């Protein structure tokens, strides 16, 4: 589960189409349970085709975890939580999750679950300790806004 800056051309190995429907944390499980699973690039135009329309669309560059997901791809906006305004606010977040891998099997692997307000990410071991063998999505990567500096 890598944390990557949106940075251009770090690895030089080939570039192409990938898409994830986006949800907000505030939206909750309902949005995740409704986002389109099958996003199929084809024809020759290569305009992506979704089984259902979605309001917000973001793509995650085809890094290896993103490419691996295929079906069940989702992206989750997460927003912070500063005790002091002068203390720098934490950046906005996005979670690439495989909804196809809903079942909790890996203790190390983080899994998307619902917080009291919004959504949350919990360790697989913690979820198994809490007796939840199921999660909405399996997090495959972490965020960080592009830093030209």
């Amino acid at each position: 589960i890598p944390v990557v800056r949106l940075k251009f051309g770090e690895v030089a190995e080939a570039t192409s189409v990938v898409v994830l429907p986006v949800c907000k944390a505030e939206e909750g499980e309902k949005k995740i349970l409704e986002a389109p699973m099958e996003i199929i690039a084809g024809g020759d135009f290569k305009v992506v085709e979704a089984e259902k329309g979605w309001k917000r669309w973001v793509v995650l560059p085809s890094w290896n975890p993103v490419a691996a997901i295929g079906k069940g791809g989702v992206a989750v906006s997460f927003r912070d939580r500063k005790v002091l305004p002068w203390d720098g606010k934490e950046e906005p977040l996005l979670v690439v999750a495989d909804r196809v891998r809903n079942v909790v099997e890996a203790d190390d692997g983080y899994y998307l679950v619902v917080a009291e307000n919004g959504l949350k990410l919990e360790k697989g071991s913690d979820l198994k300790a809490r007796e939840v063998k199921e999660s909405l999505g399996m997090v495959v990567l972490v965020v960080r806004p592009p830093r030209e500096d």
């Binding site: 800056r5 940075k7 770090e10 830093r147 030209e148």
Partner: peptide
């Protein structure tokens, strides 16, 4: 740190 992912930032911090 992951050189295959953070490499862009590692170089830019050093560049500064």
């Amino acid at each position: 740190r992951d050189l295959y992912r953070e490499g862009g930032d590692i170089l830019r911090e050093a560049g500064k």
